[PDB]
Amino acid sequence: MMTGRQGRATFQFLPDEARSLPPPKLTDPRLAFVGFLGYCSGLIDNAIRRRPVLLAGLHRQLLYITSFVFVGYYLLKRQDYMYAVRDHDMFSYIKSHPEDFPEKDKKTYGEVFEEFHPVR
């Protein structure tokens, strides 16, 4: 639905307007989980090649963690940008079409009638 956004800089991973958003924190729990997945991939690499799982090739395990965390950081920046754009579009549309989103005159429960269904 958002393919033809008016301000869509096409075929750009992170358009310039994304720089107005706060970056993901390096302590982001989603980034920590991505790092954990990288660490699991490192352990699996040892297992399938019959090296000692925990100790073998610590350099290789480190590059698994770094690359997952590095790619994870940019994917989260785009993720947060795409939801920010969704909200920005939604609120602009609601403002441009007030006749479609009227504030309801909403009553108290003392005034509204709800049927009673006894449980007996």
Binding site: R19, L63, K77
Partner: protein, 49 residues
Amino acid sequence: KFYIQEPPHGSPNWLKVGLTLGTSVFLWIYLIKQHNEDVLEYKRRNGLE
């Protein structure tokens, strides 16, 4: 010597080890640098202190 034939992984591939560790350091340094500039640019555009 135990193995009758010398294993392909008998000794470390010091070239790969060096390029593996250097790559991790580069990405980490680059990532920290990227994050610091994003925070600075986020603060500048939002007029934050």
